């Protein structure tokens, strides 16, 4: 990663053994459950493009998904080149192309040069955006159920149904409950529970609804 030293300067630091194992373990244990993506973002703090490729490459299984990620990265790389075609300048470094941001045609030293420039060209952060876009697609693919297919079981505690509803909603959007969902959450509720929620009226908060349906 790139970190700040006591002298105040931004320097490269080797990726830590703890970080490498942590990412591998999260993929092994949680697969592509939506919460994996925020962990990737947190574990890749300060990463060079090289470090990001290392993390993705150290994943051993799920190589079908990883190939999908490669396809998505290549799509995002091409759009970068399309929007910044010139470099597809002595005092200045070269301009990074799509393949330079992904670490395929760039050296670690070049990556460090861009990331530590003033102003910084955040090639690591741009690549992370592309990687996260791919992971979002993967998370959706592994969502086992559509939110339209989420219906409260007759005897399921309202809290457990709401857990299923928002877990699925989170994965299918890879994410941020609009009036649509609002409507669907009540409509798919159990029969006796529905009467309590309808009687609550418009504008009830989730907190008010879950307490209200306590006792069912």
């Amino acid at each position, epitope marked *: 990663p790139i970190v700040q030293n006591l002298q105040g300067q931004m320097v490269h630091q080797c990726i830590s053994p703890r970080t490498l194992n942590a990412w591998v373990k999260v993929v092994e244990e949680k697969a592509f459950s939506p919460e994996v993506i925020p962990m990737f973002s947190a574990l890749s703090c300060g990463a060079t493009p090289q470090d990001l490729n290392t993390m993705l490459n150290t994943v051993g299984g799920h190589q079908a998904a990883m190939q999908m990620l490669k396809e998505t990265i290549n799509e995002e790389a091409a759009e970068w080149d399309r929007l910044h075609p010139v470099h597809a300048a002595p005092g200045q470094m070269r301009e990074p192309r799509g393949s330079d941001i992904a670490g395929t045609t760039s050296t670690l030293q070049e990556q460090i040069g861009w990331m530590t420039h003033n102003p910084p060209i955040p090639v690591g952060e741009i690549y992370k955006r592309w990687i996260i876009l791919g992971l979002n697609k993967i998370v959706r693919m592994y969502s086992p159920t559509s939110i339209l297919d989420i219906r409260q079981g007759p005897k399921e505690p309202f809290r457990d149904y709401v857990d299923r509803f928002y877990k699925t909603l989170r994965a299918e959007q890879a994410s941020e409950k609009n009036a649509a969902t609002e409507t669907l959450l009540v409509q798919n509720a159990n029969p*006796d529970c529905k*009467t*309590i929620l309808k*009687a*609550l*009226g*418009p*504008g*009830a908060t989730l*907190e*008010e609804m879950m*307490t*209200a*349906c*306590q*006792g*069912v």
Partner: nanobody
Amino acid sequence: DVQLQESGGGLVQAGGSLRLSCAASGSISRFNAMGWWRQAPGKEREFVARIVKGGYAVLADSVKGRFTISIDSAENTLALQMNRLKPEDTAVYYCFAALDTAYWGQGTQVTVS
């Protein structure tokens, strides 16, 4: 099981106040949520008030400035005090309570003229 009935309704002038009361069987602290709805003749059911166990009361916008909802755990009753009544407030009023399912009273008539 659980039966509830409203009372306190009648005929009031425009520009007046009234206090409605919703009586509950048993102890009122056992209900997890209670509230009030109203319907005027020919109009769709309109939402009035809700109080949830452990919760601050929330009121509708057409009444937000005026009406107040209260709970007397001693007398086991949930009161809705109506003030600054308007002619449009003439409607049929229903109370509701939440336990293992939802229970309603039959309602009390409020007429402003």
